[PDB]
Motif scaffolding. Structure first.
Motif, PDB file in Angstrom:
ATOM      1  N   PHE A   1       0.802  -1.287   0.021  1.00 41.85           N
ATOM      2  CA  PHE A   1      -0.059  -0.039  -0.031  1.00 41.85           C
ATOM      3  C   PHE A   1       0.925   1.140  -0.232  1.00 41.85           C
ATOM      4  O   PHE A   1       0.500   2.353   0.614  1.00 41.85           O
ATOM      5  CB  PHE A   1      -1.033   0.114   1.219  1.00 41.85           C
ATOM      6  CG  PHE A   1      -1.837  -1.035   1.131  1.00 41.85           C
ATOM      7  CD1 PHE A   1      -2.909  -1.351   0.150  1.00 41.85           C
ATOM      8  CD2 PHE A   1      -1.868  -2.146   2.169  1.00 41.85           C
ATOM      9  CE1 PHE A   1      -3.598  -2.520   0.172  1.00 41.85           C
ATOM     10  CE2 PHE A   1      -2.563  -3.394   2.118  1.00 41.85           C
ATOM     11  CZ  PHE A   1      -3.641  -3.462   1.069  1.00 41.85           C
ATOM     12  N   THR A   2       1.899   1.021  -0.476  1.00 41.32           N
ATOM     13  CA  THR A   2       3.166   2.321  -0.514  1.00 41.32           C
ATOM     14  C   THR A   2       2.548   3.621  -1.251  1.00 41.32           C
ATOM     15  O   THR A   2       2.640   4.529  -0.741  1.00 41.32           O
ATOM     16  CB  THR A   2       4.456   1.680  -1.129  1.00 41.32           C
ATOM     17  OG1 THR A   2       4.819   0.577  -0.485  1.00 41.32           O
ATOM     18  CG2 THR A   2       5.490   2.907  -0.847  1.00 41.32           C
ATOM     19  N   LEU A   3       2.186   3.378  -2.527  1.00 37.03           N
ATOM     20  CA  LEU A   3       1.718   4.499  -3.034  1.00 37.03           C
ATOM     21  C   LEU A   3       0.162   4.794  -2.645  1.00 37.03           C
ATOM     22  O   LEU A   3      -0.518   4.161  -2.208  1.00 37.03           O
ATOM     23  CB  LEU A   3       1.400   4.179  -4.671  1.00 37.03           C
ATOM     24  CG  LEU A   3       2.750   4.279  -5.570  1.00 37.03           C
ATOM     25  CD1 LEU A   3       2.847   3.379  -6.536  1.00 37.03           C
ATOM     26  CD2 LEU A   3       3.308   5.830  -5.755  1.00 37.03           C
ATOM     27  N   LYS A   4       0.051   6.161  -2.664  1.00 41.82           N
ATOM     28  CA  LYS A   4      -1.506   6.703  -1.836  1.00 41.82           C
ATOM     29  C   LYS A   4      -2.438   7.361  -2.952  1.00 41.82           C
ATOM     30  O   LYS A   4      -1.863   7.528  -4.057  1.00 41.82           O
ATOM     31  CB  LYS A   4      -1.084   7.532  -0.851  1.00 41.82           C
ATOM     32  CG  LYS A   4      -0.202   7.080   0.315  1.00 41.82           C
ATOM     33  CD  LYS A   4      -0.553   5.957   1.156  1.00 41.82           C
ATOM     34  CE  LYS A   4       0.314   5.485   1.986  1.00 41.82           C
ATOM     35  NZ  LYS A   4       0.093   4.159   2.777  1.00 41.82           N
ATOM     36  N   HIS A   5      -3.532   7.392  -2.477  1.00 40.56           N
ATOM     37  CA  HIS A   5      -4.666   7.871  -3.492  1.00 40.56           C
ATOM     38  C   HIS A   5      -4.595   9.261  -3.323  1.00 40.56           C
ATOM     39  O   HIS A   5      -5.296   9.917  -2.505  1.00 40.56           O
ATOM     40  CB  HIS A   5      -5.892   7.317  -2.957  1.00 40.56           C
ATOM     41  CG  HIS A   5      -6.095   5.628  -3.406  1.00 40.56           C
ATOM     42  ND1 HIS A   5      -5.754   4.912  -2.306  1.00 40.56           N
ATOM     43  CD2 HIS A   5      -6.661   5.154  -4.532  1.00 40.56           C
ATOM     44  CE1 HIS A   5      -5.945   3.610  -2.831  1.00 40.56           C
ATOM     45  NE2 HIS A   5      -6.491   3.840  -4.167  1.00 40.56           N
ATOM     46  N   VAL A   6      -3.730  10.100  -3.867  1.00 43.53           N
ATOM     47  CA  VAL A   6      -3.211  11.518  -3.652  1.00 43.53           C
ATOM     48  C   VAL A   6      -4.137  12.491  -4.398  1.00 43.53           C
ATOM     49  O   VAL A   6      -4.098  13.643  -4.000  1.00 43.53           O
ATOM     50  CB  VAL A   6      -1.681  11.574  -3.902  1.00 43.53           C
ATOM     51  CG1 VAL A   6      -0.916  10.894  -2.960  1.00 43.53           C
ATOM     52  CG2 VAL A   6      -1.542  11.472  -5.364  1.00 43.53           C
ATOM     53  N   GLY A   7      -4.999  12.167  -5.499  1.00 40.45           N
ATOM     54  CA  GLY A   7      -5.651  13.133  -6.196  1.00 40.45           C
ATOM     55  C   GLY A   7      -6.193  12.523  -7.633  1.00 40.45           C
ATOM     56  O   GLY A   7      -6.045  11.211  -7.904  1.00 40.45           O
ATOM     57  N   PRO A   8      -6.728  13.310  -8.361  1.00 42.87           N
ATOM     58  CA  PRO A   8      -7.230  12.926  -9.505  1.00 42.87           C
ATOM     59  C   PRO A   8      -5.826  12.115 -10.568  1.00 42.87           C
ATOM     60  O   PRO A   8      -4.859  12.769 -10.731  1.00 42.87           O
ATOM     61  CB  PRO A   8      -7.682  14.104 -10.266  1.00 42.87           C
ATOM     62  CG  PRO A   8      -7.858  15.295  -9.090  1.00 42.87           C
ATOM     63  CD  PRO A   8      -6.974  14.766  -8.206  1.00 42.87           C
ATOM     64  N   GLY A   9      -6.142  11.101 -11.054  1.00 41.40           N
ATOM     65  CA  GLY A   9      -5.326  10.720 -12.021  1.00 41.40           C
ATOM     66  C   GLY A   9      -4.617   9.380 -11.545  1.00 41.40           C
ATOM     67  O   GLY A   9      -4.125   8.745 -12.390  1.00 41.40           O
ATOM     68  N   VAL A  10      -5.013   9.242 -10.292  1.00 44.11           N
ATOM     69  CA  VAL A  10      -4.202   7.913  -9.593  1.00 44.11           C
ATOM     70  C   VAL A  10      -5.134   6.716 -10.264  1.00 44.11           C
ATOM     71  O   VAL A  10      -6.373   6.903 -10.542  1.00 44.11           O
ATOM     72  CB  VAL A  10      -4.575   7.930  -8.167  1.00 44.11           C
ATOM     73  CG1 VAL A  10      -4.561   6.454  -7.288  1.00 44.11           C
ATOM     74  CG2 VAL A  10      -3.649   8.857  -7.312  1.00 44.11           C
TER      75      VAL A  10
END
Length: 164
Positions: free
Chosen positions: A87-96
């Motif tokens: 789960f290292t990358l996060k749901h940071v914004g549009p385009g994920v």
């Protein structure tokens, strides 16, 4: 470097254009490889001809159920399902770009592209890339969704593959 892949998307039989995605194989190699191979179709199955079946404005656009076309199906290149890699990358914004699932360790082929920050999915869905080009196409797709997720146009990945 990391793969670049593409999805060419129609709505009601007319082209919207191309979404280009970078797959973070450095972070999530197994998850990236699955998506890459499903774009090329090289295992004999994959995304070509399948749909965005669940689209919710101000949330996300979901696709990848190339077996049942409704959110119940899909399969990975490894088998029906595979574990949450990290789960290292996060749901940071549009385009994920992130894997849809039915609970822990149920990744198959379904995926979604976020149209907002979806922070509550951190630790629950494996993020594996992002949109490089074609957010305009994603916004068109999003505009054909509804609160229930039912689409108001038939949204088809007509072509897909690997750019590099």
């Amino acid at each position: 470097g990391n793969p670049l892949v593409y999805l060419d998307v129609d709505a009601n039989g007319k082209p919207l254009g191309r979404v280009v995605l970078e797959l973070k194989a450095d972070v999530v190699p197994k998850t990236a490889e699955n998506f890459r191979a499903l774009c090329t179709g090289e295992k004999g199955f994959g995304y070509k001809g399948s749909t965005f079946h669940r689209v919710i404005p101000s949330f996300m656009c979901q696709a990848g159920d190339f077996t049942n076309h409704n959110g119940t199906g899909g399969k990975s290149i490894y088998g029906s399902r595979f574990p949450d890699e990290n789960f290292t990358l996060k749901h940071v914004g549009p385009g994920v770009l992130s894997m849809a699932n039915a609970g822990p360790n149920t990744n198959g082929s379904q995926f979604f592209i976020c149209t907002i920050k979806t922070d509550w999915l951190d630790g629950k869905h494996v993020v594996f890339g992002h949109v490089i080009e074609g957010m305009d196409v994603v916004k068109k797709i999003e505009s054909f969704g509804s609160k229930s997720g039912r689409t108001s146009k038939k949204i088809v990945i007509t072509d897909c593959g690997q750019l590099s």
